[PDB]
Amino acid sequence: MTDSIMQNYNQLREQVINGDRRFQHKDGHLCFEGVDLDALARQYPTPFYVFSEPEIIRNIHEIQQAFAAHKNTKTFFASKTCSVMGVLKAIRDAGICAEANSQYEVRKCLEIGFRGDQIVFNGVVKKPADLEYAIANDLYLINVDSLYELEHIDAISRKLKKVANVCVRVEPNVVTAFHAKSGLDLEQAEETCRRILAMPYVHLRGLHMHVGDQVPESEPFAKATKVLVDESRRLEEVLGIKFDLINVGGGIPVPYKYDDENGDPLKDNMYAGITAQDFADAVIREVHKWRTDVEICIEPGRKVTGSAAVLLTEVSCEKRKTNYDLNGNVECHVEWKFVDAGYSVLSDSQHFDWFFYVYNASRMTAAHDAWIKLAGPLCDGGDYFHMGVKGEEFLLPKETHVGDIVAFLDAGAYTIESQTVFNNRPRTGVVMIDKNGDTRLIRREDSYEDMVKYDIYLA
Template identity: 55%
Template sequence: MHHDFDSQRQYTLQHDRRLSAADGQLQMEGVGLAALAAEFGAPLFVYSTPEIRRNVDEIKQAFASHANTRICYASKACSLLAVLQVVRESGISIEANSVNEIRRCLAAGFAGSQIVYNGVVKRDEELEFAIRQQLHAINVDSEHELQAIDRISRQLQIPVRICLRVEPNVKAATHEGLMTAFRAKSGVDLADAEGICRQALDMPYVKLCGLHMHVGDQVPDAEPFGAATRVLVDCARQLEAALGVRFDMINVGGGIPAPYRYATDRGLGGPDNMQPQIGANEFAAAVIREVHAWREDIEICIEPGRKVVSSAGVLLTRMVTAKRKTLLREDGSVEGQVQWCMLDAGFNAIPDYKDWYFYVYNASRMTDSHNQPVKLGGPLCDGGDYFRHGPLGEQFLLPEASAPGDVLAFLDVGAYQLENQTVYNAQPRSAAVLIDGPGQYRLIRRQERFDDMLLLERDLS
């Protein structure tokens, strides 16, 4: 097992388009990561502009056989303004799930016509703001929401484009918390779609553009996407015939998986969704096949988030202290010894609520063999604040010479980690740096300060 992990480390250094080593230290896009931690402090998120662009290009190429494709980056994956600007410059559109996400998209330079708006809760004031921006589409989640859109659009006398989110109820082999079928809160029943769409057709400022769905996140195989698209297409075909309309678009949502255990990694097993067998090409083929069986002219809208930014982000954390402890069984007998390495980043920086696997390397000693089993603990006053999913179960592998002061790198943390940071124990939220190319990097978010934490309690206006 140690050999498998270390072989993967060496393979990654030799073949990964993002990573390399110089003077024994890990580099990303030619920039030394330990040096970034020294300059900006840790914990520190580091993002790669070239990797974001490469990921977007992969998705574009995957959908090249369907020219009328709209790629809408799911901004919830990482909504840093600088990251959103890189996404915008790559030539794609964007998806938002709250009015403040819409505002972030606008602040990053997106036009309202480039934004689709999701969400199960859209308050009247949020809908009013969205309608005023003349978005590409609002994905309607309920009959009640549609009626609110009708009322507000009449008051404003502004047309609004909508899609109706339906629930295809297709099983996908991913983490239970990432499932959106059977018992999920989003969307309407297929049986209710016609009645709701008929209401929309009678609303003077509402333009019914099509249907929307979402299968799930980090789904490891293509079949659920094909099956769900087939359900969505069948529903759209039936609605076009029953209502005498012709839809402009069909939105199949997101879900393109990103690898957290790489295809070349033959080490410890784990959930299939950590080592998916598909990527953008297989996702696109499954979707396009089903849509083209119906219509080849319609706009296909997709909402990838994780695939765009996951591999573009690394978290740097410093080892602050280390110690050995005895492992005891419940009967008091000794099971063995364990080496603990305590980091300045814990679940406050990388929430582990979905049992995720990350490669962790010593960025300060990247070319040393990683063969020493250790447990990695965070700084929080919580006995559960330690990382549980390493190459040896709850243990990770680091160089034997690892010592306090070393910088560790968690790979592939670009999606949903920075966005989910907490301030538990008054731990500040992390700074972020963006690497634009070899030797080119910039601070795009400073670390939270103590005064920032008190601001909402001091400024009560």
Template identity: 35%
Template structure:
């Protein structure tokens, strides 16, 4: 059985003999032409995702709108494709607002999230007259009122509320409780409503906003957030004496990062079944939109803010094997890409599925420890911290009454978040090309230059099969800023 049959390839990926292809383009040839590491995006997949999510939202509620969460990937070419498909945009900073405007989004197509909006950012948002500022605190609302008064403008706002609903694949991406840094609880909401009532000439409370997390795998969590929104919106409207114009249900819709058949590319004692069982984002969004139509009624507009589910599966990262060694019987592979290009692999121990893109006709029959090139032991595609922690926990629990093998397995799965090894062809060696799938979200935005490594080039296969450069690879001189280069003179 070859690698292509062991792995469940998404439709945009195909195996052509030994080589992996994206939208029919040989990825080995692309890596040779553009260098490695290299992000490759599918323009067709991106546009298809945008169309599918918008159609799903509107199938449930005729006044549904999608505001793409641009923090997931705010590359201008990506933004222009999303805008061309009829979507609006959610931004998280003045910089993202600037990029949204550069991509052609109109002020009425922009909502502004964020927990620490500066005066300058609020001046920009209020001056433009954007669709809504999602207010994160009572203090921020006071600041908005001051800025709007000074500018002689009316600020359109939505109140971001903490719903107390759990959601998200890891603690670091759960945003629906007061344990997170986002939104207002009930006491602070009452304070914000007092501020709003005191500044009706400059504050238009047009909506309510919530967000329960990212990669939320359970539809009931989303449905519960709709019911919460219905109750809370009625209370806010009662306090203000007017109905809300829009209700923003946030994002967090999941994608399946696993792409493996039973037994393929799974580390021993590691379970990725939750990822694999994730309902498609479009189906979940349609169900939520229908629930919103029932519980919230036809009058308010319904907003959604998908990010990851829009762009994650539109891209992959190509990386070369540069070195290998053995630790006992286990072979180790050293790639030219590490957490400098995929920060979430270390920050939240995120799983990215791995294929040998140059040996797709060979069985994935050997287990490898896979690491990146950085001078840092945490630069690896397994959970080094979790593994060390588990050794200590297991030693403490060993022999204790009531600690069954089943309990140990459950605790280990919660402690060690990534497979210890990856299944790849036994012949995998330096020079081979490895593809990490579903890297379109939170990758281009988070790259950095640790250990003097340049940020990667990114290209897109457009709908007409042309190759569009999204960003060039950093040059060596990009490792120092302009002032340093001037000071160094002829040394550069």
């Protein structure tokens, strides 16, 4: 029962420190790429995130090796997943390209060293100023998400006398029109492509789709890819062209729970279900029914960085609350542990019911043998971590003390830009472990002077 959950969770804890490519233990402390995380959290003020460049490289290798059966594959990291400049730099130095989701993301990618021919710009709202900036910078692709936005691409490319390179985003009906804001209908692809061919400064490269995020099955990718391949094949015949590419988007899942033998990915997508190899096998099998020479573009986000960070947060308070009966005798006790990170720091734990493994990094070799509830510091009754090991309860060593460092694993995707300054708690610093195992700060914690510098006031 609960004893079996505790035994299972401690087997997973032992696997973290005795088999996991990312982690070790030393002096009783969790280590990441040889870096003692208790020690690291004494150097830098908690809470903060620490990223591993080695793990980013491993994730990228998994993705690229998955596509070995198709040589002409181009990989664009979805920078909305994490765009801290040192993280983008690690990804650039690992040899892949970048996908951007706003004018400022395009600019960041250019400023960290991605060339224009290494950038894809996606979005449902690309205003004229956004489009002008992208076209002026010779981006590899600007997707086309609506007919309205295409009229601006035609007009602006003519004004600049510069070619805009596009893919037409189609969303296959695998309710789409009522639940999917993005893309054109499949029915609209032929006429849209026809008109693009006639535009003097717009070049049509191919079609685009994106299935979703943390997808726990391969069938959605296979079916959606087939829709895109069949339409690509047909339009090549109808229009008398050969497409440069097909862009199949992202959505390769990451394991957030590892004990797959106990999990159902279609009911709980914290279990990853498929691997990068499964995603590639499905995509390539469909593309190769049409062409083996065509370029396949992919836009993985979560898979590049998700497993490659840990959130380190200090236990900063504790209390016991007790439910009493009618005679004043104890019914049960609840042990609350408060950490210095809440949902303003780790937003998806609250807003998207996201699970992350939690361990006492200061006592990582000790049995996690006590049921606790884990709270954040925000003055808000809802700011505690509800996605526990058993219901809303977590497991930590009974020896846990204030001052210990708690780690949340798999904290590298969609965790930095989603932070807030609610309660005027600062957004976190971020540390990078580089390929040599050395650490450096890559984002400062917001200072007080940051809290008010955006405001205009006299004091």
